[PDB]
Design a protein around this ligand. Structure first.
Ligand code: SF4
Ligand code: SF4
Lengths: 367, 54, 305, 367, 54, 305
């Protein structure tokens, strides 16, 4: 506990960092790709402790932000379609996704139209709802990285076993490791990666090793305590200077080199990897997880064929959320940040999602 | 977005856990081998892993 | 929420000098649902709120007036229960509820409680009197009421029940005053709506000064810490109904702190920071690890993150 | 000239108004329905001269604001469709309409996509363009009340005579008098109407008489000089007190009791009255002007059949432009006015259109 | 959004007008009877009416 | 347009006291397209702008330095022509263009002209010295340059050609100063970008005072009035390149006005209003008919309405 939050520990690390960064050749840009990490860095204001030549940028570490509008709109179309077919569907979605904006309106607006939209907290809450209403089809707009794809693929097993029938999900799950790669390949720069802790809990270090071996970028599977990130930033500064390219499981207390094999298998059971669309980022190959041809029954899209309007802009004019998800800029480098765009009245998803880099910068009033 | 909690009760794949004092239920479909002695990581009401004597 | 009523003084504690003292006059309504919550109820909430509204302006509670708007078909026991709390609380000050009024409306609403109060202050105090160098004190734990009520809504139960801090704190203020002199209490604000962060920002903004707060010195219950993280909201932005923020002359920072701690309602009181010349109008927070960031007041009522 | 702007005249009128309003029973709400009028009142700050019991509210006096998104989006669909058919169309539209927002983006965004969008100033500029490029089909997204429906229906005559072939227009013309009626019928209150000057130039007083006879509301066809409006406000205050219900052609210098019969006829030649949709206001019967079955050739919609997506919100969450067009509130009675919504970064059309009540309040910084 | 102007030249249905000093062309498809002596009301480059000795 | 360069003094007239005087140092770039316009060109614009930048800060033009960035393949006659204007204008002050530099870039850009200048002011002046009661004066017609250039773009031609007012006005300022004393000129601002409205708002905002302007007293050409209405833009928001706003002690309002009018560049000068204690930071305009409204600075470059 304490040792992982201790000011002594932190001030020793900060000092060590300061020293190393002193003999550093230029500017080191370490990157993390987990929302929780950004929150950790910003909440404890770690950036206000790092040397001028040591920078920490955010990546596409928000499952909600990168969820394509095309799918959100498509889910609303199914809602209206299903109704036009005497089928009043029960929609369950996370609190923030519930508010995500699209040119066609948000899920919250569909709620203000008579549709039954219920904010759940876990795939299970949805499961609880399904049995409590076997008359109506209950569907869960399911977004999320490896960390949330597991619970879902785990509840589908309890759906196959119980052979439950009114338990569907709109699969918009995403794969973290791939996005990190598409980024390196697309120009985003950084000398070290702070691998997302809990994403690594599921796919284990093994799941990351391939990026280091392929691009030579040192990694660190870090936890979430302030000292966890500070410890990880230290290692990366070193590996960079000494010339290494290896992964270090700082979060070993909660990570198995091979991750949880149970979840892995379970996921691989109901989902198959496919090319996916990342909002404001484009099409990333092998970064999506749609239900396998077999369990085509758990995918609400199987029952309803819909036509999503073409030419639906990803973000509103002015929103630089695309550059924020790529680690090409912080939310403070945005002309609308803190002005026209705030959690109350947001412009882009980066400010809506609970793990949005922008919502986190506003929320903790970055210095 | 997970916080650590001490498992105080187990009932098949439906363990119960305590977080600094909160009683909340937690599915165990990902960690079938959880004894009330174990401490787990809860993510949206689920167990993803068990801690270590770090 | 538009401030039309302002230009159409108004909407804040009013002072009326008379004799050698000042009459402090206030009023506040309550639409708290449910009428009942862990540690208190609308009735106590009504009296405590108004008494405190007068305490932070440096006025001694002289009298209360209560107007109740009751919706047709209200569990009578509920109403009796509420009235008991009001009389029970008012006596804790002490302060008499000299007058009242009651109305029955057909609309289904359970009940609304409008409370007014008058106080006498020989030495008025406002959230605009904070001076550079001054010490910032909070009389107790932060996040009690807010988290208490939210936890009741989300099923979250606690080992030992976590309850609201709803209660008048005139005794706490009086203590300090009688121990260091009114002249030495530069500013006060009750951290209710929007929490401590809002309260501090206000003092800072209305006194045109920067306020430095040390995260490590802010009193927070272990129950509140856990619950706050789970719901995804910081205990700094949740409501407090039995606490007072006090800006005191630096030379009396230690004297005041002890005075507060000598009382039951100020038992956990503590010194959380100081006023500075930099960052005027802002609140700067020094995190536990030595980091720094601003403590911004929430935009709207909080929801789990 | 001067006499129509003279401070002496104005101060005499203001005094006269002040006196009359003194013996007035309550609060008189005079309404105008022309953008130019709102600009006159706000530019010279007439409101800062009227008694507390005399109020002047704005009506749907903006042809651009009330233009349905459905049509704007539809026009963009034709642009893409036409292209998918080797037909690169030339789009001409007014400066403000060019920027009007829709969930599918504005005409300006279509310009940033390779499409040829040219900002014209009059239907003629479009005409000039047509002949200068008889290879490509030049279309004009044509909005406007009687005042602008005339030039258009006048150029179609020069199109029929010359038998021109590449001269098309997207007809979204509107009728003023009808909207005024739908308003009375729908709850909007006012004791007098300041009839739009130039709309009355075309349809003449005759075109308005029917509202007075049917609802007993006194009217005044006013000009646009500050004294014109002040003179009109005076008459209405009187007719109200004395109990009359008659129209007074204050703008007689530029208005014929029967208006211009040439334009009338000409319009009635190419257009036929039909039920139309008014953005943020709903469907007003007999308030639209689509080309008659005969000249179905001048309507770009004849050549291309398109499918506009359903469920396209009229305004973004928070925009009270609907209440502003109904005279149920001024732009200052809006939570976004001057904050999140400004000409630079607007939310609703009321702030985009050159004649938008909101753009006018911001522009002249109302007191 | 119209402003008043003095017609200084006429050429069939294509009159020319002056506004406080600006030379701008103006169609006459709505006012076929316009002599350079007349003053007109221009709306988007067109003539809608002619003034009076008011 | 982000003020990163500010926190990364900077970006405004700089004063450096030396001896008993102050050295005023400034610099400004020009990307005016086309390089040529009715009444002037980039060259005159460059020199006039910088000379004026020094005049409004109370410094006498001591010297100019010019750096030109020329794009490969620039009509040589154009460049010669521009250089003539610069030398021609600089002599009108008078002020020598003591140094220079030239660069040739392959990029097709015609030309950019960067000008720096130094001045000596024994009595510095800034847009933050306006005091309540003071008179507000504008040295000439408003809307000349802005409307001139816009009209050239929109084909709009005029009986007698309407041209820019681009020209240095040190002579105008010096006149006033030598007639009423520097101590009596409280504030100045050149109404260039954003026009007169922007200039006034700035003085008002940086001096924390309200400024009342009478629409009936603001000098505007008959050509500008007509053109402004047609393009749908008010002459208050368009650029001026040969005018100066001057806030003078009330007791010298009349003396100053005459001094300005005694010069060619201040021939149409006039008194347009006064500083007031109300509406601090705002500019209040009293319309011709006696009405009142604020004169807000445009958000972005104007377009026809
Ligand atoms: S602040 Fe808003 S607008 Fe700027 S990128 Fe972040 S969400 Fe997009
Ligand atoms: S200001 Fe904006 S947002 Fe408010 S109604 Fe007028 S345009 Fe709509």
């Amino acid at each position: 506990f304490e040792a992982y939050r201790s000011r002594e520990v932190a001030m020793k690390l900060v000092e060590k960092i300061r020293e190393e960064a002193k003999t550093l050749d230029g500017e080191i840009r370490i990157m993390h790709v987990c929302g929780t990490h950004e929150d950790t860095v910003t909440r404890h204001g770690i950036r206000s402790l790092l040397p001028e030549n040591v920078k920490v940028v955010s990546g596409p570490g928000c499952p909600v932000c990168i969820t394509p509008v095309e799918d959100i709109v498509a889910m609303q179309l199914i809602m209206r379609k299903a109704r036009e077919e005497g089928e009043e569907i029960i929609l369950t979605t996370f609190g923030d996704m519930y508010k995500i904006p699209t040119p066609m309106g948000s899920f919250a607006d569909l709620k203000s139209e008579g549709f039954d939209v219920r904010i759940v907290y876990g795939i299970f809450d949805t499961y609880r709802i399904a049995k409590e209403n076997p008359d109506k089809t209950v569907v869960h707009f399911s977004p999320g990285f490896e960390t949330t794809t597991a619970p879902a693929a785990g509840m589908l097993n309890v759906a196959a076993q119980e052979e439950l029938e009114n338990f569907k999900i709109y699969s918009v799950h995403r794969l973290t490791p791939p996005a990190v790669e598409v980024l390196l390949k697309q120009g985003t720069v950084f000398q070290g990666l702070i691998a997302p802790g809990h994403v690594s809990t599921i796919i284990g270090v093994k799941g990351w090793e391939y990026l280091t071996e392929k691009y030579g970028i040192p990694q660190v599977v870090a936890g979430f305590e302030p000292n966890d990130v500070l410890m990880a930033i230290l290692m990366l500064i070193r590996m960079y200077k000494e010339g290494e390219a290896r992964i270090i499981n700082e979060y070993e207390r909660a990570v198995k080199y091979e991750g949880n094999v149970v979840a892995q298998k379970m996921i691989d059971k109901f989902f198959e990897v496919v090319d996916a669309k990342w909002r404001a980022l484009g099409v990333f190959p092998k970064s999506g997880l749609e239900l396998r041809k077999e369990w085509k029954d758990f995918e609400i899209r199987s029952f309803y064929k819909v036509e999503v309007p073409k030419n639906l802009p990803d973000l509103e004019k002015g929103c630089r959320c695309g550059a924020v998800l790529r680690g090409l800029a912080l939310p403070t480098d945005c002309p609308l940040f803190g002005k026209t765009c705030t959690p109350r009245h947001p412009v882009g998803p980066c400010m809506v999602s609970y793990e949005g880099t922008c919502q986190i910068f506003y929320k903790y009033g970055v210095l | 977005l997970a916080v650590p909690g001490k498992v105080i009760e187990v009932n098949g794949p439906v363990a119960v856990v305590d977080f600094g004092g909160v009683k909340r239920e937690v599915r165990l479909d990902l960690m079938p081998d959880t004894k009330p002695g174990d401490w787990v990581i809860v993510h949206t009401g689920f167990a993803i892993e068990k801690l270590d004597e770090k | 929420l538009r401030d039309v009523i302002l230009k159409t003084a108004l909407d804040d504690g009013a002072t009326i000098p008379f004799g050698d003292k000042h009459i402090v006059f206030t009023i506040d309504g309550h639409t708290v649902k449910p009428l009942f919550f862990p540690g208190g109820d609308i009735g106590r909430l009504a009296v405590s709120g108004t008494v405190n509204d007068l305490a932070v302006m440096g006025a001694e509670p002289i009298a209360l007036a209560n107007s109740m708007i009751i919706g047709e078909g209200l569990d009578m026991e509920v109403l009796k229960r509420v009235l008991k709390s009001m009389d029970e609380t008012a006596r804790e000050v002490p302060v008499p509820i000299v007058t009242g009024d009651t109305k029955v409306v057909e609309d289904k609403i359970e009940m609304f409680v409008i409370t007014a109060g008058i106080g006498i202050a020989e030495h008025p105090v406002s959230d605009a009197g904070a001076k550079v160098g001054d010490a910032v004190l909070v009389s107790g734990t932060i996040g009690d009421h807010g988290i208490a009520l939210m936890s009741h809504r989300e099923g979250i139960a606690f080992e030992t029940e976590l309850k609201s801090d709803v209660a008048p704190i005139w005794d706490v203020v009086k203590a300090v005053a009688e121990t260091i002199g009114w002249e030495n209490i530069h500013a006060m604000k009750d951290p209710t709506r929007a929490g401590l962060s809002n309260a501090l920002n206000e003092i800072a903004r209305k006194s045109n000064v920067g306020i430095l707060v040390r995260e490590a010195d802010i009193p927070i219950r272990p129950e509140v810490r856990a619950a706050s993280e789970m719901l995804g909201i910081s205990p700094y932005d949740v409501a407090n109904e039995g606490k007072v923020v006090m800006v005191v002359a630096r030379e009396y920072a230690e004297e005041a702190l002890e005075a507060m701690r000598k009382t039951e309602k100020g038992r956990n009181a503590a010194i959380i920071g100081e006023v500075i010349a930099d960052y005027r109008g802002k609140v700067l927070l020094e995190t536990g690890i030595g980091g720094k960031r601003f403590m911004e007041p929430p935009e709207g009522d909080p929801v789990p993150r």
